[PDB]
Structures are given as C-alpha cells and as structure tokens.
Amino acid sequence: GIGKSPTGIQGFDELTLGGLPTGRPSLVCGSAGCGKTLFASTFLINGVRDHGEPGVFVTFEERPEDIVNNVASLGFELDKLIEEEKIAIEHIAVDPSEVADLEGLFLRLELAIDTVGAKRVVLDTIESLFSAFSNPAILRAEIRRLFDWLKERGLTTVITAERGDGALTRQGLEEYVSDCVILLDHRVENQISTRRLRIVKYRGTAHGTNEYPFLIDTDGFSVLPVSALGLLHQVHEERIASGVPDLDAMMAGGGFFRGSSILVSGVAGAGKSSLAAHFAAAACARGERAMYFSFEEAADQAVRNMRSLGLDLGRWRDAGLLRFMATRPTFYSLEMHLAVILREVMRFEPSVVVLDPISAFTESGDRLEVQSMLLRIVDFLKNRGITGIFTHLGLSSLMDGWVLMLNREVNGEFNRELYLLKARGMAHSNQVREFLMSDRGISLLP
Amino acid sequence: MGIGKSPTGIQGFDELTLGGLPTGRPSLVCGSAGCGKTLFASTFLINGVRDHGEPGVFVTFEERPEDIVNNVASLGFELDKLIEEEKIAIEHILEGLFLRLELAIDTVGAKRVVLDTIESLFSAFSNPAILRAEIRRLFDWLKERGLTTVITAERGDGALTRQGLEEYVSDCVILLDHRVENQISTRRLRIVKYRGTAHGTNEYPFLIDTDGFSVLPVSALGLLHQVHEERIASGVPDLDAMMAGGGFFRGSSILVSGVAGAGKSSLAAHFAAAACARGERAMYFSFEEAADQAVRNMRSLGLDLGRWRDAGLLRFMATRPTFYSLEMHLAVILREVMRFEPSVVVLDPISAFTESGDRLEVQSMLLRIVDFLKNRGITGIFTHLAGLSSLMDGWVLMLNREVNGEFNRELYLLKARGMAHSNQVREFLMSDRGISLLP
Amino acid sequence: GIGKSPTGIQGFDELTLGGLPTGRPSLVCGSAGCGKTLFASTFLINGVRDHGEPGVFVTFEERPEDIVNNVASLGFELDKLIEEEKIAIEHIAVDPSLEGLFLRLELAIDTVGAKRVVLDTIESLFSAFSNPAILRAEIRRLFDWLKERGLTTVITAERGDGALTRQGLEEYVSDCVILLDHRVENQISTRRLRIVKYRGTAHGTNEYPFLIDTDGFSVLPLGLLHQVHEERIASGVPDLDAMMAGGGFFRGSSILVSGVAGAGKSSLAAHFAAAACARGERAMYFSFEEAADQAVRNMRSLGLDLGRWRDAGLLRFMATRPTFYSLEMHLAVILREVMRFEPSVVVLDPISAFDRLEVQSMLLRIVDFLKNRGITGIFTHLLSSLMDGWVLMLNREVNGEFNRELYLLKARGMAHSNQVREFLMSDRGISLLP
Amino acid sequence: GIGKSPTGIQGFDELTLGGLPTGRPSLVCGSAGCGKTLFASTFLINGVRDHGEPGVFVTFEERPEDIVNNVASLGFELDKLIEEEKIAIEHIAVDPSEVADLEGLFLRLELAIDTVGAKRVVLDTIESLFSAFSNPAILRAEIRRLFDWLKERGLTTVITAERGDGALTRQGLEEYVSDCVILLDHRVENQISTRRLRIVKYRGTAHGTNEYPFLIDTDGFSVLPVSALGLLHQVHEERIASGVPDLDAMMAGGGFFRGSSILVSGVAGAGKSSLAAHFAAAACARGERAMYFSFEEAADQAVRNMRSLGLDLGRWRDAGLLRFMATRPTFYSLEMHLAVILREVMRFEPSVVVLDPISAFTESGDRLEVQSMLLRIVDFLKNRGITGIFTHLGLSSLMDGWVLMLNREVNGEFNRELYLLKARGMAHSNQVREFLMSDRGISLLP
Ligand SMILES: Nc1ncnc2c1ncn2[C@@H]1O[C@H](COP(=O)(O)OP(=O)(O)O)[C@@H](O)[C@H]1O
Ligand SMILES: Nc1ncnc2c1ncn2[C@@H]1O[C@H](COP(=O)(O)OP(=O)(O)O)[C@@H](O)[C@H]1O
Ligand SMILES: Nc1ncnc2c1ncn2[C@@H]1O[C@H](COP(=O)(O)OP(=O)(O)O)[C@@H](O)[C@H]1O
Ligand SMILES: Nc1ncnc2c1ncn2[C@@H]1O[C@H](COP(=O)(O)OP(=O)(O)O)[C@@H](O)[C@H]1O
Ligand SMILES: Nc1ncnc2c1ncn2[C@@H]1O[C@H](COP(=O)(O)OP(=O)(O)O)[C@@H](O)[C@H]1O
Ligand SMILES: Nc1ncnc2c1ncn2[C@@H]1O[C@H](COP(=O)(O)OP(=O)(O)O)[C@@H](O)[C@H]1O
Ligand SMILES: Nc1ncnc2c1ncn2[C@@H]1O[C@H](COP(=O)(O)OP(=O)(O)O)[C@@H](O)[C@H]1O
Ligand SMILES: Nc1ncnc2c1ncn2[C@@H]1O[C@H](COP(=O)(O)OP(=O)(O)O)[C@@H](O)[C@H]1O
C-alpha cells in the first residue's frame, strides 16, 4: 500500500483513513482565508508534538515572525518548537531574480531539513518563485523537479496552492502533478459563510469524496468526525422515565426505550417545551446529567416558565446535572450549529438531550440540509445511547417515538389532548388522552 | 464488417461499449484530477493481462513506477508481481519518442499500452496547428503499430482536455467526471465519442471501491421481468387469503403505504421472516433504523429476525440516505442484492430517498430497483410514508386513523394486479402473535 | 427556388425542403461525437446510391481505412464503392507547416467525377492562420473555388470552445449551417440538429432531435390532418359500447381511460385489443410498467387470452421504460413500430408514465400520427380535451367497501348515456348493469 | 428633426415611426441566420420599388449571383432591378491585401453610387476588410472614416454586423459609432426558435424599445404591426345572435354585444365547442363570414361532430363564409401562432372568430407569455369589431362575456348546467339554466 502520515486534524485523518500520503507532496488549494496556511501549520506542529517528526516551514512571502504569531493565539507555542529545534522556518525572498538556479533553493531546503532532522515539510507560496515561469511546459517541468526532489528525499510535504481564478489552482497544473489534492473553500450563502473541505484526489487510498464542513475556531482547524456515523446506534431494552408518569404508563413496559429518539410535536402553547423540560428534570433527579438546547428561549426564561409548572430546573443547573445552551439559528450557522451541538454533548456526557425547537432550523436551509443535519444529530445521540427529545411545530419516520400535543378549540374553549402516535417495539394505548397543565405539572385525565 | 473491440474487464463499461475499447487504436480517457483516468487505464491493462493474457505497458512521462505500483497496490492489482512475471511493464520518459515507446513495448511484448501525462510533452507546443499535427502523428503511429492504447487526458480549464484538440483527434473519447451537488460527490462516466460502433450515450455512474473501477451493468434492463404464477407468503395469512390464489405473485413489487406507526416495517418484517422460515434468503435494507434495533422492535410482534440473521438467511443493511447520492445508493443496493442472491428484498423506507432528489431522479432509481428485482424474480417490498403504484404489482395501505378519540388500525388492499382480491377494508391488530385481521 | 441536393436523410431533407444547397458549401458544426462526420458520409453515400452523384471525401487528418471501417458497421459498404469508383477518399497530411491544395482537390474530383464533396478536418490547415482577416479570406477563397466548380460540398467544423466553430468565421462565410449537439439533461443525452442558417429558402428553424442508430443518421419527420371515419369500434365491453348511440366509439378515435390504481384501465385496454384481434385486426400494446408475459397472465384472470393473439401474430406487445432514451426517442420507436405493423388499434398503458411541455408535445404527436394513419388509440392514465373519448373508472370507498363504477364523460359526435354504470370484474371479464 | 427613410417592413417602420434614419448609417447586428442580410436586401429592394430610391449592395464575401438567387425565392426580381439599373451590386474580395488605401474602396463605392444614382447603400461583411485592423483605436478611426464618408454623401446606409462572441458586434465598436442599431436574434427555448428584433439605439427619434418577434416566411421579413394595439377597441351597441336563442334571451337586449369577447369555459365534454360552432354557424347563416380556429380537432372531424348536433358547418365552408384553421400549439410557435391568427383574419375579414381551445396554449409558455399573446389577439379582434368566442378548460376579467358549462354528477347521473357569469353593459338572468344537447342543438330547460 501507501504510507499515511497523520496530520492531527481528527476528522481529516478519519476521512483520509490515516492522513496525508507519506513521502509524497500534498496540495492544499483555496482562495485567501480558506485555511491552507493554518492547515499546513497544524500539519507540521502536530507532526512534531504527536509523532516526533521534525518539520521545516518554507515561506516565500509571510515573515517567520508573522508565521509564529499568527498561531500563537492557538497556543501552538511554535516559538517554543523553533527554539527546541523540532521545527525550523526558512524564509526565501526575491525581486530581480524573478525575471529569470532552482538548485540553490534545493540546497537551502536540504540544509534546513538536515539541521532540524525534518521528516515533514511545508512549502508556502511556492507561487512567488513559480509565477515567473510563463511557458506551461517549463512551469510543469520545474514543478516536477521540485516534487520529485521531495519524493526522493521521502519528505511528507504539504504544498500551498492559491486558487486564483481557477477551479483549484491559478495555473491548473499542481492539482494534476500532486498525488493528494485537497480544496478548502469559504462559501457564502444568504450572508452566511461555511468552510468546506474536499479530497479532490488521493492516489493509493480510499477516502471521503463528499464536501465536509470544517471549522477554524480558537481551537484551530477542526472537522466533524465521521466516527459518529449513522445507523450504528446503541440498542437498549431498558426504558426511560419521562417525568409524566401518565404518559409513561400508556406504553407497555413503563415508558420509552432508553437512547430512544422521541418527537414532541404540536401547535404553539401546546406543552412541547413543558414535556421536554419534564424529561430533562426527571433525568437530572434520577441523577443523570441532561442538556437542554433552547433555540427560541433564554435559559433563565425557560427556568422561570417551567417554575410555573413546578419544575425546578435551577436546582439541576446548580447541581451541575442540567446544562442549558441557548442559541438562535442565524447565529452559529447550520454546520456551525451541528458542530457546537455535538461538541458540547461530548464534553458534558449527558444522558438526555433536548432540542427545543428543531423547527427553528426549518427556515435556515433547504429540506435536504435541515433533514440531513437532523439525521446527523439523531445518529450521534443514538450511537452514544443518549435519549433525545426533539420538539416541533417526514421526521416522524425518523423518530423512535411520537407524541402529539394539541390545544384545539371546541364549543368556544381550548382543550389539550395528547396522542401517542408512534412507539416502536412496544404495545401502547391507542386512546387519545386529555391532559392538563398546572402547578403539579402535566397530568392526564382518565 | 464492424470494428474490433478489446474488453477492459469493467463489466459495465464493456457492456455499454458493446465489446470494449477499439482494438489497435488509441482512446482518450479525459477527466479532471482524481476522476479516475489513471485508474481506468491501469484496470484496462490489468484486466487485459488477467482475462486475456495481453501484456501491458504503462508509459508515464512524469510519475515514477514505484509510485504507480503503490497507488494500485491497495486495490490488489499485484503490479509488482506482474512486472516480475513480465506481463506488465511500467516505463518512465517525434521519431525518438516512437523509439522509446517501441522499447517500452518490447519489455513485455505489450499488446495494451497506456500513456500517462502525455501533457508533459504536448504542453510545449504553443501553436495550435503544430500541436494538432504532432498529436495526429502520435495517434496514427499508435494506430499502425498494432497496439490498443489508452491515453489519459487532463481536462484542466476545458470541456474535455486542456487544449481542446485530442478529443477531436481521437476516435474513442470517454469523460470521467466527479460532480458535487448538495455536498455529495458522484462519479460519472460518459462516452462522448466512439467512431465505428453504437454505445451508451448517457451518463453512467461508477464507483472506485475495494472492487476497483466498477460500473453498474445495464444488463438489468427494464421490463424484462420474471413472471411467476406461484404466490409468495407474506407471513400474514389473512392478508394472503384476501387475494385469490393465495396472495401476491412471487417476484412482484409490493408497496406498503401508510403513516408513521401504521405497521409498514412490521408487514415487511413478516414477509422476510416467512421467507427465511421457508428457507429462502431475504435482505432487509433499513434506511432509518439499525439492524439490531429492527430485530428488537420486531421481537415485540413475535418475529425472531435475530434467529434468521444468525442462520445466514437474513441480511440486514443499515444505510442513511443522505450519506450517498441516489445513483450511488442504487449501485450499492444492486451490488449487494447480486452478492447475496436473495428471494425477498425489503426497502424500509424508500420514502427516505424522496427528500434527497427531485421526482425524476428518485422515480428513475426506483424504476431500476424494481426492474432489477423483477428480472431476477425477487419479491420486492417497498415501505412508504404518490403515483408509485406505476411500478408496483401490489399495494397495501395501512392506516392508524382516529375515530372518537380512539385509533383504529385498518388495511386496504388497493392493487392486486392479475388476481381477484378483496376490495374490502379489514381492521387489523398487532400483537406478539403478529399482524391479525379481525373477521 | 434554389437548387438542392438531397442528403438521403428523410427527416433532414424534409426539414430543409429538398436538402442541402446545390453547388454551394454547407457547414456541419458540432463538438466531438455529435455526428458531423457521419452526416457527411451519409451525404456522400446516399448521393451516390440514391441519385448517382459520385463523391469524394477529402480528409486532412483521419485515415481513409479508418473512415471506411468507422462506417462498415452501418452496412454502408464504402469499400465496394471505392473499388467501383463511385466514391473516393483522399488523405491530405500536414506537419510543421495554397493553390496546390486546390490542384490536389481538382485531381481527386476528376478521378471519380465527383459532384459531391466532403471536407473533414480542414482545421488541420485553418488552425495556423492567426490573423482573422487572413483566415476568413482563405476560407472565402476555398468556398468560392467550390462554388465555381459547382460541387455540392459538406464541410465539417469543430465547435471546440466556440458556439458554432472554434474560430467563429466559417459560420458567417458559409451559406448553410447545421449545428449538431449532444446535450445531457438528467444523465440522459439527446442529439439535436438545428438549421442555424440556410440562405435562399424557407426551412425548419427549430431544434430537431435525431438518432445515430445502427441504421445511421435518422430524423423523425406530423400535422393536424386527422383521417375521419364514421365506422364504429367494438370495445370488448359491449354494454359500454351500447351506452353510445350507434354502438361504440368512432374508428380512428383517441380514447382516455382514467382512474385510480386497480380501476380497470389496463383491463379495458386489453379488452379493446382482444376484441380487435378476435375480429381479425392487427393490434399493438405499448406498456411502460408491465412485461408482456405479466400482462397476459394478469388478463387471463379476467378471461382475456392475449397469448392467442400474440402467437397468431395479430397482437404485438412492446414493453419499455420511460426514463431511458428521452421522449422524442420514445415517440420515434413507437412510431416506427406502428408504421411497420399497420395496426388498427394501438394502446399506450400508462401515458401517465411519461417535462410538462415535452410530454404534451409528445402526446399531441402520437395522437396526430395515429389519427392520420386512421388508427384508433387507447390511452390509459392514472388531455381530457385533447382526446375524442373519455372513460372514467372509479373504485370508490363506500361503507368500508370499494364499489366499482363507470362514467362515459366524453364521446365527441354522438349521444351517450349521462348515467353512471356500476361494473363488475369477473372471470368472464368486464360487465355492467343499470 | 431627423429624416426617416422607410424600409418596407411595415412593423419595423411603425416601431421606428417611419423607418431608418436618412443620410446616416444603420447597423443590423446578429449571429448567423438571424436576418441581417435579408433585412438589408429588403431595405434596398423596397427603397427602389416603393420610393424610387436606387440602391447599391456592396458585398465582401457573398457572390452577387448568390445574393440575387437567395432572394429570387421571395419574388423580389433582383435580377430584374439590376438589369434595369435601379440596384447595383459591387463585389469586393481580398486576400494578401488584408495583412495591411481604403480610399480605393471609397472610389469604387462612389463610382457604383454614381452609376446607379444610388440614394440607399448596403455594406455586407465590412468585417472582411476591417478584421485586419488589430489596434482598437485604428479600427475605430477607420470605421469612422467610412461612416463619415457615407454621412457626407447623404446615403441611407444599412451596414451588417456579425455578433460573434459579443453582445452586439464582435469588436464592440460599430454599435457605438452607428446612430441606429438593431439586433436580430434567433433564440431557442424548449427546442422552439423565435426570431426577435430590438431597436437598441436610434438617435433623434422615439421608437419601440421592447423586443418584437418577427418572421422570415416565404413573404420575407415581416413584423407584427403594432397598429392593432390594445384598448382602442371598437364599441358597438348592437347585439350578436349566438345560435342558442335561449342563451341569447337571458341577456337584456337579446344577446351579447357585437364585437364582444366571450369566454365559454367548462369541463371536457361540457359543450364549449358546440356553443362556439353554434355562434359561427349563426353568423354564417346571417351572411357574415366566420373563422373557426381549432387547436385540438381537424376541420372535417369538427364538421362531423357538429353534424351530430345539427349544425351543417360544411354548407358554410362550401359557401366560403366559414373558414376552418386547424393547428396544434407546438407547431406554429406561440409568436408564430399569434402571427398566423392575425394574418389569416386580416385576409378573410371575418365577423365572428372562434378560438377552440385557448387552453391549448396553457402549457406552451409561462403565464405572462400566454396571457399577453391572448391580450394581443383579443385587442386585435375588438379593434376590428370582431366577435370573439374563446373556449377554455384571470381570463374572465379580460372577457366581455362569460358562459360556464358544467356536466356535474348528481345521484349517479351527469346533468349539464349553464351559468351566465358575466355580461358587461346589460341586465341578465342570475338563474342557473339546465341545458340539453340533441339533434336540435343546444336547448335550455325552463
Ligand atoms: N489564530 C487564529 N485564531 C482563530 N482563527 C484563525 C487564526 N488564524 C487564522 N484563523 C482563521 O483561519 C483562516 C486561515 O487563514 P490562512 O490559512 O492563514 O490564510 P490562507 O488560507 O489564505 O493561507 C483565517 O482567515 C481566519 O479566519
Ligand atoms: N400553572 C399553569 N397552569 C396551566 N397552564 C400553564 C401553567 N403554566 C404554563 N401553562 C401553559 O403552558 C403553555 C406554554 O407551554 P410550552 O411548554 O411553551 O408549549 P410550546 O413549547 O408548545 O409553546 C402556556 O400557553 C400556558 O397555557
Ligand atoms: N486504492 C484505492 N482505493 C480506493 N480508491 C482509490 C484508490 N486509488 C485511487 N482511488 C480513487 O481514484 C482517484 C484517483 O484516480 P486517478 O485516475 O489516479 O486520478 P486522475 O483521475 O487524476 O488520473 C482518487 O481520488 C481515489 O478516490
Ligand atoms: N406488541 C404490540 N402490540 C400492539 N402494537 C404493537 C406491538 N408492537 C409494536 N406495535 C405497534 O407497531 C408500531 C411500529 O410499527 P412500524 O412497523 O414501525 O410501523 P411504521 O413503519 O409504519 O412506522 C408501534 O407504533 C406500535 O403501535
Ligand atoms: N457504425 C456506427 N454505428 C452506430 N453509431 C455510430 C457508428 N459510427 C459512429 N456512430 C456514432 O456517431 C457519433 C459521432 O460520429 P462522428 O460523426 O465521427 O463524430 P464527429 O462529430 O467527430 O464527426 C458517435 O458518438 C457514435 O455514437
Ligand atoms: N377474476 C377477477 N375478479 C375480480 N376482479 C379481478 C379479477 N382479475 C383481476 N381483477 C381486478 O383487476 C384489477 C387490475 O386492473 P388493472 O387493469 O391493472 O387496472 P389499472 O390498470 O387501473 O391498475 C385488480 O385490482 C383486480 O381487482
Ligand atoms: N428565400 C428565402 N425564403 C425563405 N426564408 C429565407 C429565405 N432566405 C433566407 N431565409 C431565412 O432568413 C434567414 C436570413 O439569412 P441571412 O439574413 O441571409 O443570413 P444572416 O442573417 O446570417 O446574414 C435564413 O437563415 C432563413 O431562415
Ligand atoms: N346528438 C347528441 N345528443 C346529446 N349529446 C350530444 C349529441 N352529440 C354530441 N353530444 C355531446 O357533446 C359532447 C361534446 O361536446 P363538445 O362541444 O366537444 O364540448 P367540449 O368542447 O367541452 O369538449 C359529447 O360529450 C356528447 O355528450
């Protein structure tokens, strides 16, 4: 096979089944601000601090001081690594030389490689040297000289590529001369930007072909890990207590399955948030830890509103079992939102997760995007064994349980009814049940 | 007096080209980066040596042989073994070019040639007429030498090739394409030109998996259905009894429509369990619930899907629609149905694809699925949460409808093609004894 | 009226109102694999075979043996014609490189006494002219030369990146321009031909789909001149027939059987076809969701034995899939089979299986052809004003049981029953009551 | 003001309020086959045969023999005019001269002008001479030399322009140097081609700015005449007899207004075609002449079908009062269809015009195109005083009268009812009326 050098970006390495190709040049293309320089920096830094592989960073415009300080904010301590002689930075600048001896660069490169003992290399803005080459055949020959140099030396090299007016690179050659080609793009849609990565080419390995949204937060380059893939869900035969005993009773077995995904759907003011809060509070009382993701209400406001029904979510927030997360759709974009959901869930290790409401994303993306991000969330939760409570104003087919709460007018008065529409794996009551809200909470009438 | 074809060993490609590539003539596999031109040419050579003994030479102008060999070693091409057996050679590099090629060919007496990165030379020619003359010189040399050549071409910022002339100088031109839509990449092959023969003019999706370069074969053409008189047992004897003759015809396509919690997955599980208990092998494609979850939920109704699975008769496949494209979904389905050769297939629910494509794409996919299963005499069950009765030989509508604050479960036998069927509506009950219709 | 030379493609000659312009050059433009070379080959070979007009194929790049073999499969049999001195192929080659070309041409044309010429891949020469003025001046010199000699010439133009040709001038210097394009839509590729310019004549200006089949370059030639007959047709359901004054529908009519699934659309269409075959008429049944054996099996349930008629050769059952080769291609296949079989009754089941405007045009054309040929057509659907008769078959829920009823919603030119008729399906078939 | 030289294309001259500008150069741009050469030919020919204005046709590639024969099919008898010395053709060809004395062309031009006494000039494929000029400033200067030459001589000149890759002309200069610029385009939509003309520029005059569909039939360049514009309708206080006396009675005054537009709408088999045929037959019996435009039925078939109801449309067809026109939507494109409708109506001078059905165009164009072409037809008819009967399966607001024919099921039987929904300018019955079809025709029950 082909050897794989890992980068340290967990999601990227997973999608590439081990990382970049070892002893070969890799191309990371994109426009300005897409993440190519930071990806190469992370490649080098993680190669040193996770695989004892020293690195050299060749820069043709960006100053070495700039290169270290532009990552100091991510705590990479590149200044540290440079003083410790695990990473070196070689700066090459030109001006009258460009009109027209690349062996000099080869010598300088080899010298830095030997000083640091480098096994990984980064070549940033090679365009500064190769934009002088006007004839395409000559440009191709020289790029081949450089890439074959690196191959011979067996250095794992990440080479930057400016997209310019082109689909991958300005001149449209390095994408064909490289063995692994990655595209980073920063696409805006309805004033919202999303970073996406794509493995366009990778000889000698399978990988993910699709576009994969990624992130450059204060924690650096980060990709959604495919590990939490779909349909590997944990199956539990134990049941969950919802906090509404009269609902829990309607099902044979005493309640919904643990790690089940249950959709509470209805009209506004029908009790969806109330039921979800009941779920979370029952879990926290049992001693589990729960997450409540509000997208329409503030955490303090939800605690208040539920106080009216007798749920003291504040007690759980203080104990540290319940964690509220309030965020509106426009802020934290759809992929951003998926990422924060999954991440904060990993950190808190909840047992029950409530999404109130999953309709808040209905108007923030086409049917496919909304449905697919919801698929990802539900798969993540069930693979972790988390009981998910999704409130809503096709999803029913995706959910393990379905509760419908209706405040309907009859004879000049609104009555609240509850339907258990779906409850896979059990017998359950077909009978509509009237339900009342009060200080005692949600109750069901005979 | 048709032309002569040399097969590539890619079943789908050879079926679409009616024999393979033009023999003794150069073809042009155009494509962007990572679309599979080099892999298609490598497969051409490897299948030539394995299936028909025709030695092969891979002439690369820029990439090195060890890199070629490692690039394909992960797919089990055993290039190194073939080079030692002197069946395949990998040589690195206009009369001089011709001599170097004759050398590379003499290494193993190659009958199949591949030209990788011919752009190294042809980018030097700036004048269009000169470039065209040289290209035609090379292509005519390859025509006369008695070798079947596959030439890779770089699309670049072009429709097929970067300079836009080799596609016109060649006689067989195939575009390899990797198009993204809704973040999903689909690999497609197209025959843009093929002089001397009929062939598939449409776009055809293909995979580059552990099986290599693979095109779905159109040998499962539509409307060649296997027609059987024998009936298939549903596992619900009252349902099968509603139909004169004992139930649905074997090899039929049967839709099970309804609202969530209506019993569609349950009826389909009854079908699969009945088949496995008869000793036939069944396949449950679940697009929404994991295999173990489905087994658990069906145990409640009293079906030991787990027993049938461990017996090897039942194959569960859990697959999220959004993970692939619709074309790739069809390809994966059909491939696994081939590998398993089941008698009963379940798709639970096909409605999970409607979201992932417009009516035309999903309808075509379901056309191909039903045509495949019926051409093989496989009874297909499709659950649904819309005019799909077009492709369905049978149709069962399961309702869980509210009356007086109570939900009654009813069954409609809407379509029973070719048989007297009860058009009455039957109330049913679900229990540990399964699905039972009340008399 | 300009002088025209037929190409031999029925549809193309009909569209161009006689064919290509005589003694003048024509420009067949297209991207790679669109059919310009085959079009030119057909021009020449049909010229020699149908009109005795010898031909010369001047190729600047492609080899003559390649030219012969790339068309041998189509039965054109060019090699015999070269031996017989009806057609010639002349290979002009160029490598790092004015009237000498004209000299060689003239020699070629005189060897075989050619009145038709093809010029394939003049780009070999015209790609070296950088100056646009120079290039078009040379193009004009060539076109003039050909017009002075009076040879009907088809010139191939490579579209390349351009909209017609790579350099964008031959389309202006030529008098007749035909753009062939192989356009993909939903992974389905359709070949279209368009007469961009044809000086001196009216002609079809739209895009016309064509097919390069194993028979070759083919275009489908329909109109609103329906053949009118009073004769009445037996439906197989004599009571339905009786509901109509005189005893049925008009022979040549177009009928729509509409309803839900399991309503009896295919049953009624099979009844029509079986009645026709029984009285001795050739009937055709185009299904787009059912195999022929499946149809005979399912109709034997109601008592129709279509196997009898199929074996007798009176019934021809054809099964296709709509999503394969595009709507106009379908139309073409259905049409060719109707032409072959000269059926009295044609069935299309379901027509709903076939975007909106395309399907509307296809259906209008099918009805037009059947009517003009005098054939009665039974269309099934899961239009009402485009047909002549309309039968609505209902399987409606009443008291938790589906009752089966029939409406005769439309029957142009006759008094029918405004009454609904409850109908029963049984081993004997379709029956009704008042 | 500016002098206007008419071309002979009635619609073009109307849209330009008199034709091209006199003594100035005009540019007719377009791709191949759009109608520029034929427009210039018509310009010259009609200038000679309608305004005693002799012409010269300068051609730079197309042979003079070709130029005459390519119009012989239109009966222009250009060979005649050339022998009679009213039009001349001057052919200029080049080849080695193009690499690099335009005064020679000026001399040749002036000589032809003086021979024929020309007042109109056409310059066809000036590109053959001016494509040699590479520098844009020099090309502009030379084009200005030529156009100023023509201006000085006061010749009304039509200059061809090849569109090429450009929006109007290949080099993008003549459109700015000309005083009148016209664009001819041949746009395909759903495999159907439509010819459109546009006055892009015309200094010194008002004109139509919109795109105007035109035609090149066997009668040559032809434009829809805007003269039959909208809302100048003829207003009649006399009434029409529909042939259904019981319908005519429901309206105060004895029937619909003459020159009225009446929409018969309903379900299939409801009697729309029958009522329309009754209208046409009543008119033809009165002695008027009527047109019946079928888009779903053949003329013989419609005569048969109506025979069943007792209308002998064959008698009227034979008398010459009734004229049938059968054509399907796809054939005779939407603009094509408008054109044939209007034209054949002008020729036949009908009194009643039936369009059966105007729904046949529902699926052949977007709502705006269908509605606007229908607007044009209705305006044309009412401006001529023609009574229009439009059958159908927003238009109601456009129609002067509205009849609704419904075959509705009740108690397992279909009954036919007739509603007079609208009838401007009169009192009319609000009562639904049952109607029966028989050999006696359409009758209404008390
Ligand atoms: N220290 C940092 N902290 C947070 N975000 C950063 C940091 N550095 C860069 N980014 C984000 O990642 C992007 C990466 O920029 P960079 O890769 O250096 O430029 P390019 O991709 O053009 O080479 C920036 O545009 C910014 O949005
Ligand atoms: N003490 C109480 N007694 C009765 N009803 C209450 C009480 N407190 C809150 N509610 C009801 O709860 C509703 C809000 O429920 P909520 O959980 O927000 O449902 P949704 O999520 O559908 O908006 C209010 O409309 C109100 O009728
Ligand atoms: N061993 C492998 N396993 C799976 N996929 C592979 C393997 N080798 C190559 N591929 C696929 O083929 C693509 C490269 O094919 P190749 O023909 O070499 O590229 P190009 O189209 O640039 O010539 C990669 O993007 C990858 O998805
Ligand atoms: N033992 C049982 N008794 C009664 N009903 C049951 C039993 N087990 C499962 N069910 C019913 O089966 C339903 C799940 O059926 P399923 O096959 O998932 O239908 P669908 O696929 O239409 O959602 C539950 O809603 C429940 O009502
Ligand atoms: N013998 C044949 N049988 C069927 N189809 C053919 C045959 N020869 C050529 N074709 C078809 O004709 C198309 C174009 O042929 P050709 O005219 O040579 O292309 P070009 O546009 O380069 O001239 C091909 O795509 C192929 O499908
Ligand atoms: N022997 C029979 N007795 C009663 N009904 C029958 C018999 N054979 C077939 N059928 C009916 O015919 C129907 C199939 O009719 P079909 O022609 O397929 O209608 P459609 O084309 O509208 O689907 C079935 O639903 C079935 O009820
Ligand atoms: N004699 C004719 N009879 C009918 N239609 C014609 C005639 N001559 C030309 N046409 C139509 O009008 C168009 C005008 O062509 P022309 O104006 O000469 O070319 P261009 O517009 O490229 O200069 C032709 O493409 C053809 O469709
Ligand atoms: N002699 C008759 N007696 C009764 N009804 C008739 C007679 N002749 C024709 N019809 C009726 O005329 C209808 C056709 O009317 P038509 O004018 O085509 O209406 P539409 O234009 O709405 O289709 C048929 O459905 C039929 O019921």
Residue numbers in the entry:
A (entry chain C), D (entry chain C): 2 to 101, 107 to 399, 411 to 463
B (entry chain B): 1 to 93, 108 to 399, 410 to 463
C (entry chain A): 2 to 98, 108 to 231, 235 to 367, 372 to 399, 412 to 463
Give the article text.
Here we investigate the primordial circadian clock in Rhodobacter sphaeroides, which contains only KaiBC, to elucidate its inner workings despite missing KaiA. Using a combination of X-ray crystallography and cryogenic electron microscopy, we find a new dodecameric fold for KaiC, in which two hexamers are held together by a coiled-coil bundle of 12 helices. This interaction is formed by the carboxy-terminal extension of KaiC and serves as an ancient regulatory moiety that is later superseded by KaiA. Our kinetic data identify the difference in the ATP-to-ADP ratio between day and night as the environmental cue that drives the clock.
To further understand its role, we generated a truncation at residue Glu490 based on the phylogenetic tree and crystallographic information (KaiCRS-Δcoil) to disrupt the coiled-coil interaction between the two hexamers. Nucleotide exchange rates in the CII domain for KaiCRS-Δcoil and the wild-type protein were comparable (19.1 ± 0.8 h−1 and 18.0 ± 1.5 h−1, respectively). The phosphorylation rates were also similar (5.5 ± 0.4 h−1 and 7.4 ± 0.3 h−1 for KaiCRS-Δcoil and wild type, respectively). These results indicate that the extended A loop and not the coiled-coil interaction plays a pivotal part in nucleotide exchange and autophosphorylation in KaiCRS. By contrast, little dephosphorylation was observed for KaiCRS-Δcoil, for which allosteric propagation was disrupted. Consistent with this accelerated dephosphorylation rate mediated by the coiled-coil domain, our crystallographic data showed a phosphate group on Ser414 for KaiCRS-Δcoil but not for the wild-type protein. First, KaiBRS binding to either KaiCRS-CI domain or KaiCRS-Δcoil (that is, missing the C-terminal extensions) resulted in disassembly of the hexameric KaiCRS structure into its monomers.
